[PDB]
Design a protein around this ligand. Structure first.
Ligand SMILES: [Mg+2]
Ligand SMILES: [Zn+2]
Ligand SMILES: [Zn+2]
Ligand SMILES: [Zn+2]
Ligand SMILES: [Zn+2]
Lengths: 384, 1136, 48, 158, 64, 114, 87
DNA sequence: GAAGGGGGGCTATAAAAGGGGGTGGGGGCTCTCTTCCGCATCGC
């Protein structure tokens, strides 16, 4: 069974072996019911959260973000290829944004043809700075992070999950509220076909090069971790010397864990941000995160900076042995390494203790997934 | 001299190589079975009481010695012959060895004359034999000899062949016996509960559990609150809890000082004394041993008619049913008082907070029941039955005054069928008592891949039921390090419950504690019966297999002596655990089976006892006789169980942790041979597994079990129900050190693929894959699907028989629209004949009481060629035919493919070579995966393997992806790649195949090992359009193989209600499933009798036939109303 | 018994009335097709 | 066809004094009970000399006909079962000697031979005459003689 | 089981190079040198021989 | 606070008063034996139960290889530099992070808290 | 106590026929007060006097492994009921 | 004293006679709701 990529989200479907069922209505009366009530275009906006249930996904979402960048220019031949994949195209080639020295169409120009009707939408790109709205360039965005669709044309802004995903106020949401399901149906397919074929030119990959960082970034990450180790050691000394005053409402043990977890959480955040800054505009990890197609800033930090603290039942790795987590540690070892803080990134690789503690943390997610499927299923049935 | 860090990596893998050269990978299976045959079977027969007959002449029978011959098969003519395992598989025989016993028969005729006759080697049944065990025919055969027998030398054995089915006993995980465990139940009425599961030595009559519990303080009262919490004991065979002090009185300790001396070893401690005061007051009424015994007897299993019977019964329970492991004799009351006091003492420490509560998830507190202990448990029951019927048979003859024939008294079916049935079905115990029989112990060995076969032989089953849900048993406990793979575990209801042994983990087979006890007595250990209770406080208790043997005043010297003996292998065998709890002043020694242990390098004075001379001797492992066992004899490596690991200070590596550095630990006792040994068989094939997110490692361990390859070298001779063989398996370009011992090179399950991580045409999105059509045209991931059909013709009944023949449409009653032309005259299709769906491969006709058709129809989807047609006699002597159909599976759209990092995906499209993107060299990727699969999954090991694979292919060297290896870094791999004229990060400039234009982004491309998974779309595609219906519900059948319909369940029903599609909902649930019509009486809503032929409708009960209404309802609704009517309910359908 | 037949997920009511197996249904693996509309499904000829 | 009551679980299942109030009752017919015991005896004898299940099935069918025909009602069931086992071996082409059948049976050779004659009369059936080659494979295999010696013995007797 | 006739990626013939490849390794050649001697320059073709497992040799041990 | 058993039948002795003498006495239930009471305290209940953990520590813990050892806390008795430190890890304390030191010198099981 | 009713005042086994006789004498008006419609549910009908035997379709025998019918669990149970009541 | 030899009993076949004995076949894991008991309270 072959499916459009957009309907994968409403179905919660993937293509790693998922099987879907087909039911063929056997009469006109039931055939008309499905046609007039249950067709995918009529299902675009869900009443659960008054927003679209399907949007633009992995390749098209990552590519449309690249496509609508300010500096994307298309030659005459490239543009004519894309318009072949625009079913709603009127057949009129728009005047290029640049006429001399060479005729060049921008990506926004071509996307404007995809946008149906004359809808008007205001969105912000994921990387829109907060202080730009208060600055002197509110309506002329230096970063192209302000999305304005006016009269059905994308006049500025980079499109991403925020303006094309399954969120209220999305450009896809406006198309449904304004143009209806049939025109919105074509809007979905036209985005995919046009930008999928442009991605054949621009391309998109992910490799080792996107997991590396500058030696300066590695030193900053190493220094941040080294400082975090000393900070946890200092707190341990205070607790050992009875110099730690319990925070009101918490026991001494709870106070110590809060301080240690706060130190290590901040170190993970500081190392993560340090890794993110080092990433270039060409970085493919960042490309799929800014577009919202896949991954998050935490994934990037884990791959580059540090995996971080491993937790079991919301606590650091417990003393499964007698007062120690593993036979490789001394007893009463409350340092970050003993209790499951992974100071390495995935690229660097985990040490044997980190690998095992990381396996302990991963097992919790697997147990939850098995539990969540049945625990929530019973709730759904009883509610119905 | 000493191993320098520059040579440690080679040195440590020489050690690991020698371990696997000796032990193999199914050693736990084979060693456990060898112990059961060599020792347990003889012990069970010896331990059996002599059979005494008296009804006058007196006959005695004693079973002296056990003999076992080679696995033998008897032809229908009665000629014995050795049974080869391959013959057992083909002819569906059970691989069993005849069992013989020497029986001595002495008769006393009251004439002061004794006649003694011995029946040497009396046949008493057949024992299934584990393959490649000491008693298997393949034992001691060279690899050349195995090939001559059509046996794969790489086949590890460790499984049984029952009715031709390869059966593997899964290690059953259970809480350790004879050990006192204190647990706290939040909800229960007891604040704390100290249990002990006591079992006899050699695992006699099953374990007897005793609970010592402290009542919770929840109860509010002036008397209850003032006294505190009282301790009660839950003895076996007693309905109600018995106060603890009463049990001590029944043992023979009346005075409070005497009882407290067994519970409290230091009266100077007042806190513990106050804890037992409420218990003393509870039993203040009982002040005599006989009164206490009567009190316990009053609650006995059966009511006591008189006091004398009650006292006798109570003494019986305490003597043997209570703490049997402590003692089962009449003089063991003092020993049981001390142990019972220790249980109370342990409970008090838990209540006082002085000792931490025991952890059920700790594997020190766990035992794994392997084939031996499993088989021994069955054999004890069967042998008792054998003697029970021997007594019953001999009783009849001796009663009549005639002597009895000993051979005719023995029923050989008892042991032969009892052993066979338990292994055949997996229901553990008795067929009659299947209600309490443990299920899933025996499983058909998985032969999908060699790695899957190895994994199934090292599987561990948790005691917790799969249906039950509880996170804690499913969690990855700290104590699984080095013992259980932290990654290999199934996904779903069995997460964390089914486990796999770590690579070097070993399960103790068990040994007698007699040599240890004798040495302890010789050493300065004071016996428990000779000391005064006051001396226990300062001394350390000595436990051997959970039995408190005595006390010692110099624990440090004793432990050093014990450790020295075990390292020298003088009196203590290697698998014996010696644990000293310094804080608790206890030394625990364990010798029983089921303890999980792993070999560790011994460290003395921050120095490995392993030196360069050991490595040099191992390097010449052959033509030198130096092996792994010499390392254990030399005392440089020893086995450590989970309990002993708590007391071990262990160094991950010698190169770093032993060396002088910032002072962290200057007292190291042991060292890992290599940290990569924490992984099991399936996780050991993941390259760079320490660069992946942990769930990805778990997913690959599952996927690797489903990867096609060559599951066994002799697959051609085998006729398995399903078998997948890859045309061109390759060994991975990027391998792990551990893979050398999994024989993965010899039986690979994948191909090295040029993989580009690119967004090409949108056909690889959402975990989908683009495959190169031209590469597939060249045999890339081509595989064979072998399916075997077995049919047996059996004659059973007065005139009913089944035969192989071509059923003529006129002669035979039953018939189908299939094609019967392919069948030969003998009713069997011939090899080399193309067969499609709805084709008959076996022509079977059963005589009608003319004859019905039971012919075997080829699977509808299947379209192959008959490969082999084997005909023989099965175990029952009936003519037996197996037909293998061969179908070639070219990778299609929808076939699953995975890397070794949890990145599975179906093929979304196949492009030809010209359509694929190419490098400047003309290289096109065999596979294109979406970049969006990497970021969220964080399978960085996939990217490193691709980079390392590129270097390996260019350099010509198989890359090393062993997890915790500082010698390999991404920067190092990148620098190597630069030397071959490639971008150091594995990117290449690719050209669009459709236009030839350079792609703006450079594509990460390189060799990656992928594996074709068993799941092929053509085996899953299923369509239903008015098929057959089932008899009970008259609804579409179930299953793809039965042309069943898809279920339209409650959730789909609920979904269509929200849609408001009432008519479509009616189609699915009424019109498309089971449309039915009934006639209902109008006066009463009951279904009326309708005769459409006569057009007469009557309602028997209303005496009316004019007003009957036709009602259209689902057949299942009719069945419901009729079923409700069977319960006297009257569902009356009213049309008004 | 009769009671066992009616109760539970696989019982008569929930297993055969609230939900049941149906004719004219098909099942197979799903693969991407960016060239189909969101409201289209690509179907094998064998199922059709 | 019948159902057996299972073991009690709660206190309601047990009588006022221990013993379970719901106890299994012997509802098997005398004819079926005797026939069931004969089949058990037939399988016990067959396992002693390792006879295949197909010969046992033939023996069970033979006993049912003789048991129903009731010409041997005066003879012990074990003797009929032993004689039926002997006949089944002959019918299958793998005869056992009367002594070999007697070794696995409490019934003597004379009584087996007598029941054997009656069963043939009752069933109106016959058994092909035994030849020297019908025993060579079992006798030589039990004596541990090579195939060449077995072939020589088979030729010499024939 | 047996050396593939063609390289899966480019279609170069590699089924006439397994015996030569084995002989070169017998002549103390390194795997990289032996592959170079056979003319397998693209790492797709080097992958074919460098990662091949000749199981047909094991299968010939079993009697037909 | 102390516990006594009668010298006659070695059973638990419980407190009792005599009105004639108005002096605390310990009387055995099943024995009728009586004894003069010298403690005068029937029992003491320690809600805080700040029991000195040093008493609970065993000097043998210095032989544990898994306990950390510090040379910066010399033994106060013998002056040995090396000492082994650990936490109480005892329930009912409601708070425990302080270290308890034990001298590693053999025959000197000195224990202290910093 | 299980499937048996005991009436204690002393203590006797309350037989189903005894309960049947008691229920037979309850008036229709009294039955209505007890929340039982007399025409659709009488208290005495709750006592099994005649046992309904399900149709064959409710308890069908399934054919598997030759022409040997395997009877339904209900059919097996009905055999016990028919035997005991006959006895 | 091991081994071959000789003599005699056993096996089946029919048949009659009469009675004892052998054989086979009947019969006397978590959460929620309901029920029972002890207590303190008033009432008369
Ligand atoms: Mg999926
Ligand atoms: Zn009616
Ligand atoms: Zn090539
Ligand atoms: Zn006393
Ligand atoms: Zn000191």
């Amino acid at each position: 069974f072959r499916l459009n990529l957009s309907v994968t989200t409403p179905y919660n479907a993937d293509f790693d072996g998922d099987e879907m069922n087909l039911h063929l209505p056997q009469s006109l009366e039931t055939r008309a019911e499905i046609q007039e009530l249950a067709m995918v275009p009529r299902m675009i906006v869900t009443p659960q959260s008054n927003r679209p249930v399907m949007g633009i996904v992995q390749d098209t979402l990552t590519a449309v973000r690249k496509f609508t960048k300010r500096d994307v220019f298309l030659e005459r031949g490239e543009v004519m290829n894309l318009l072949m994949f625009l079913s709603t195209w009127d057949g009129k080639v728009p005047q290029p944004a640049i006429l001399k020295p060479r005729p060049l169409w921008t990506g926004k120009q071509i996307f404007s043809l995809i946008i149906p009707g004359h809808i008007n939408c205001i969105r912000t790109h994921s990387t829109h700075p907060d202080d730009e709205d208060s600055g002197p360039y509110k309506h002329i965005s230096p970063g192209d992070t302000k999305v304005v669709v006016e009269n059905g044309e994308l006049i500025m802004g980079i499109l991403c999950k925020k303006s094309l995903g399954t969120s209220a106020g999305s450009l896809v949401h406006i198309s449904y509220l304004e143009m209806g399901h049939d025109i919105t149906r074509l809007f979905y397919s036209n985005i995919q076909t046009v930008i999928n074929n442009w991605l054949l030119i621009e391309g998109h990959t992910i490799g080792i090069g996107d997991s590396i960082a500058d030696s300066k970034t590695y030193q900053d990450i190493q220094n941040t971790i080294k400082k975090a180790k000393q900070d946890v050691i200092e707190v341990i000394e205070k607790a050992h010397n009875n110099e730690l005053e319990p925070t009101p409402g918490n026991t001494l043990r709870q106070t110590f864990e809060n301080q240690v977890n706060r130190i290590l959480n901040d170190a993970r955040d500081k190392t993560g941000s340090s890794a993110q800054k080092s990433l270039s505009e060409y970085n493919n990890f960042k490309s799929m995160v800014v577009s919202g197609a896949k991954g998050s800033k935490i994934n990037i930090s884990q791959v580059i900076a540090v995996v971080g603290q491993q937790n079991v039942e919301g606590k650091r790795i417990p003393f499964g042995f007698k007062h120690r987590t593993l036979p490789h540690f001394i007893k009463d070892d409350y340092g970050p390494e003993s209790r499951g803080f992974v100071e390495n990134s995935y690229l660097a690789g985990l040490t044997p203790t980190e690998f095992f503690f990381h396996a302990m943390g991963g097992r919790e997610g697997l147990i939850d997934t098995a539990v969540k499927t049945a625990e929530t299923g019973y709730i759904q049935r009883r509610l119905i | 001299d000493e191993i320098t860090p520059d040579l440690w990596q080679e040195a440590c893998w020489i050690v690991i190589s020698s371990y696997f050269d000796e032990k193999g990978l199914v050693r736990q299976q084979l060693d456990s079975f060898d112990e059961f045959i060599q020792m347990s079977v003889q012990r069970i027969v010896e331990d059996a009481p002599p059979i005494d007959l008296q009804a006058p002449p007196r006959y005695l029978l004693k079973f002296e010695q056990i003999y076992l011959s080679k696995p033998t098969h008897w032809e229908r003519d009665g000629a014995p012959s050795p049974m080869m395992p391959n013959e057992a598989r083909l002819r569906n025989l059970t691989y069993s060895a005849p069992l013989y016993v020497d029986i001595t028969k002495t008769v006393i005729k009251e004439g002061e004359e004794q006649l003694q006759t011995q029946h040497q080697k009396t046949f008493i049944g057949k024992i299934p034999i584990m393959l490649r065990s000491t008693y298997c025919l393949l034992n001691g055969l060279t690899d050349r000899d195995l090939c001559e027998l059509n046996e794969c030398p790489l086949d590890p054995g460790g499984y049984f062949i029952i009715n031709g089915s390869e059966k593997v006993l899964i290690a059953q995980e259970k809480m350790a016996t004879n050990t006192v465990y204190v647990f706290a139940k939040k909800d229960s009425k007891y604040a704390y509960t100290g249990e002990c599961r006591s079992c006899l030595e050699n695992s006699s009559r099953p374990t007897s559990t005793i609970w010592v519990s402290m009542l919770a303080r929840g109860g509010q009262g002036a008397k209850k609150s003032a006294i505190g919490q009282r301790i009660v004991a839950t003895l076996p065979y007693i309905k109600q809890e018995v106060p603890i002090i009463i049990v001590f009185r029944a043992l023979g300790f009346v005075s409070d000082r005497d009882i407290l001396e067994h519970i409290i070893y230091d009266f100077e401690d007042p806190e513990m004394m106050e804890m037992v005061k409420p218990s003393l007051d509870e039993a203040f009424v009982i002040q005599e041993q006989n009164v206490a015994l009567n009190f316990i007897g009053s609650r006995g299993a059966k009511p006591g008619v008189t006091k004398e019977k009650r006292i006798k019964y109570a003494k019986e329970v305490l003597q043997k049913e209570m703490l049997p492991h402590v003692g089962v004799s009449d003089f063991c009351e003092t020993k049981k008082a001390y142990f019972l006091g220790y249980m109370v003492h342990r409970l008090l420490l838990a209540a006082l907070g002085r000792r931490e509560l025991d952890d059920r998830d700790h594997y020190g507190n766990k035992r794994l029941d392997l084939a031996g202990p499993l088989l021994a448990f069955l054999f004890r029951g069967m042998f008792k039955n054998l003697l029970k019927e021997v007594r019953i048979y001999a009783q009849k003859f001796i009663d009549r005054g005639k002597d009895f024939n000993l051979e005719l008294a023995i029923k050989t079916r008892i042991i032969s069928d009892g052993l066979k049935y338990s292994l055949a079905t997996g229901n553990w115990g008795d067929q009659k008592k299947a209600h309490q029989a443990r299920a899933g112990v025996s499983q058909v060995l998985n032969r999908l891949t060699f790695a899957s076969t190895l994994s199934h032989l090292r599987r561990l089953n948790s005691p917790i039921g799969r249906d039950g849900k509880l996170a804690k048993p499913r969690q990855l406990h700290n104590t699984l390090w080095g013992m259980v793979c932290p990654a290999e575990t199934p996904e779903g209801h069995a997460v964390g419950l089914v486990k796999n042994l770590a690579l070097m983990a070993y399960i103790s087979v068990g040994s007698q504690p007699s040599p240890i006890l004798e040495f302890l007595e010789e050493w300065s250990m004071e016996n428990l019966e000779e000391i005064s209770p006051a001396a226990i406080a300062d001394a350390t208790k000595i436990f051997v297999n959970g039995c408190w043997v005595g006390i010692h005043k110099d624990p440090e010297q004793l432990m050093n002596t014990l450790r020295k003996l075990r390292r020298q292998m003088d009196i203590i065998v290697s698998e014996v655990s010696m644990i000293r709890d310094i804080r608790e002043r206890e030394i625990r020694i364990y010798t029983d089976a089921g303890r999980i242990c792993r070999p560790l390098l011994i460290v003395e004075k921050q120095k490995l006892l392993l030196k360069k001379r050991h490595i040099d001797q191992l390097k010449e492992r052959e033509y030198n006789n130096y092996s792994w066992q010499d390392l254990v004899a030399s005392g440089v490596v020893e086995y450590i169980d989970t309990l002993e690991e708590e007391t071990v200070m262990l160094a991950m590596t010698p190169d770093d942790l032993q060396e002088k550095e910032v002072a962290y630990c200057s007292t190291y006792t042991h060292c890992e041979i290599h940290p990569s040994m924490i992984l099991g068989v399936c996780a050991s094939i993941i390259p760079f597994p320490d660069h992946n997110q942990s769930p990805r490692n778990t997913y690959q361990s599952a996927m690797g079990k489903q990867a096609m390859g060559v599951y066994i070298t002799n697959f051609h001779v085998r006729m398995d129900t399903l078998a997948h063989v890859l045309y061109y398996p390759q060994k991975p370009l990027v391998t792990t050190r551990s893979m050398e011992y999994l024989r993965f090179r010899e039986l690979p399950a994948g191909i090295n693929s040029i993989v580009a991580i690119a967004s090409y045409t949108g056909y690889n999105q959402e975990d989908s894959v683009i495959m190169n059509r031209s590469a597939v045209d060249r045999g890339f991931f081509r595989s064979v699907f072998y399916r075997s059909y077995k049919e047996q013709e059996s004659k059973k009944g007065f005139d009913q028989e089944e035969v192989f023949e071509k059923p003529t449409r006129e002669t035979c009653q039953g018939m189908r629209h299939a094609i019967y032309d392919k069948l030969d005259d003998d009713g069997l299709i011939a090899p080399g004949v193309r067969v499609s769906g709805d084709d008959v491969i076996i022509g079977k006709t059963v005589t009608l009481p003319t004859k019905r058709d039971c012919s075997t129809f080829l699977r509808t989807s299947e379209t192959g060629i008959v490969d082999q047609v084997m005909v023989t006699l099965n175990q029952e002597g009936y003519k037996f035919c197996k037909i293998r159909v061969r179908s070639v599976r070219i990778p299609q759209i929808g076939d699953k493919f995975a890397s070794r990092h949890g990145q599975k995906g179906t093929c979304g499209i196949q492009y030809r070579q010209e359509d694929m993107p190419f490098t400047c060299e003309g290289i096109t990727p065999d596979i294109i995966i979406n970049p969006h699969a990497i970021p969220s999954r964080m399978t960085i090991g996939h990217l490193i393997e691709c980079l390392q694979g590129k270097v390996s292919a260019n350099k010509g060297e198989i890359g090393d992806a062993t997890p915790f290896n500082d010698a390999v870094n991404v920067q190092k791999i990148s620098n190597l790649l630069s030397d071959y004229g490639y971008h150091l990060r594995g990117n290449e400039v690719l050209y669009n195949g459709f236009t030839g234009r350079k792609i703006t982004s450079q594509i990460f491309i390189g060799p990656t090992y992928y594996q074709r998974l068993k799941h092929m779309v053509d085996d899953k595609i299923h369509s239903r359009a008015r098929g057959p219906i089932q008899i009970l519900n008259r609804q579409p059948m179930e299953g793809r193989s039965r042309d069943g319909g898809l279920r339209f369940g409650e959730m789909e029903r609920d979904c269509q209600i929200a849609h408001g599609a009432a008519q479509f909902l009616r189609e699915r649930l009424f019109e498309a499933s089971d449309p039915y019509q009934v006639h209902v009486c109008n006066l009463c809503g009951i279904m009326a009798i309708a005769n459409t032929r006569t057009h007469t409708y009557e309602c028997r009960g209303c005496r009316n036939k004019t007003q009957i209404s036709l009602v259209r309802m689902p057949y299942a609704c009719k069945l419901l109303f009729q079923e409700l009517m069977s319960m006297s309910i009257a569902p009356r359908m009213m049309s008004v | 018994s009769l009671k066992q037949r009616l109760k539970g997920k696989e019982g008569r009511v929930r297993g055969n009335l609230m939900g049941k197996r149906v004719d004219f249904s098909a099942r197979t693996v799903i693969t991407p097709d960016p060239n189909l509309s969101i409201d289209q499904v690509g179907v094998p000829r064998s199922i059709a | 066809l019948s159902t057996m009551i299972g073991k009690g679980t709660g206190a309601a299942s047990f009588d006022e004094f221990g013993n379970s109030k719901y106890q299994n009752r012997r509802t098997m017919s005398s004819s079926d009970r005797a026939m069931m015991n004969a089949f058990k005896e037939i399988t016990t004898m067959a396992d002693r000399i390792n006879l295949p299940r197909n010969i046992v099935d033939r023996t069970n069918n033979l006993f049912k006909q003789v048991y129903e025909q009731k010409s041997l009602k005066g003879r012990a069931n074990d003797a009929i079962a032993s004689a039926c086992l002997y006949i089944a071996c002959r019918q299958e082409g793998v005869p056992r000697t009367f002594k070999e059948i007697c070794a696995v049976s409490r019934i003597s050779k004379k009584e087996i031979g007598r029941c054997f004659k009656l069963i043939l009369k009752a069933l109106e059936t016959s058994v092909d005459l035994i030849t020297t080659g019908d025993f060579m494979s079992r006798f030589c295999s039990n004596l541990c003689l090579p195939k060449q010696v077995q072939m020589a013995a088979t030729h010499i007797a024939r | 089981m047996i050396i593939p006739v063609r390289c899966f990626t480019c279609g170069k013939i590699v089924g006439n190079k397994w015996e030569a490849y084995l002989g070169l390794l017998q002549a103390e050649y390194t795997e990289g040198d032996a592959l170079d001697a056979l003319g397998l320059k693209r790492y797709c073709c080097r992958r074919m021989l460098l990662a091949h497992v000749d199981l047909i040799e094991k299968l010939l041990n079993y009697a037909p | 606070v102390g516990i006594r058993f009668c010298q006659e039948c070695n059973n638990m002795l419980y407190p009792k008063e005599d009105k004639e003498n108005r002096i605390l006495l310990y009387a055995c239930r099943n024995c009728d034996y009586q004894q003069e009471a010298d403690n005068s305290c029937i029992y003491v209940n320690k809600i805080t139960h700040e029991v000195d953990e040093l008493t609970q520590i065993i000097a043998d813990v210095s032989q544990d290889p898994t306990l950390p050892r510090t040379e910066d806390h010399p033994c106060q008795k013998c002056g040995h530099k090396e000492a082994v430190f650990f936490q109480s890890h005892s329930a009912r304390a409601e708070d425990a992070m302080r270290l308890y030191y034990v001298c590693t010198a053999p025959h000197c099981g000195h224990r202290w808290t910093e | 106590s299980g499937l048996e009713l005991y009436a204690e005042w002393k203590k006797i086994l309350l037989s189903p026929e005894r309960v049947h006789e008691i229920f037979k004498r309850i008036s229709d008006e009294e039955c209505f007060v007890l929340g039982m419609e007399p025409r659709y549910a009488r208290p005495e009908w709750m006592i099994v006097t005649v046992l309904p035997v399900p149709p064959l379709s409710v308890r069908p025998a399934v054919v598997m492994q030759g022409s040997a019918r395997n009877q339904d669990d209900l059919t097996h149970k009905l055999a016990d009921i028919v035997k005991i009541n006959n006895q």
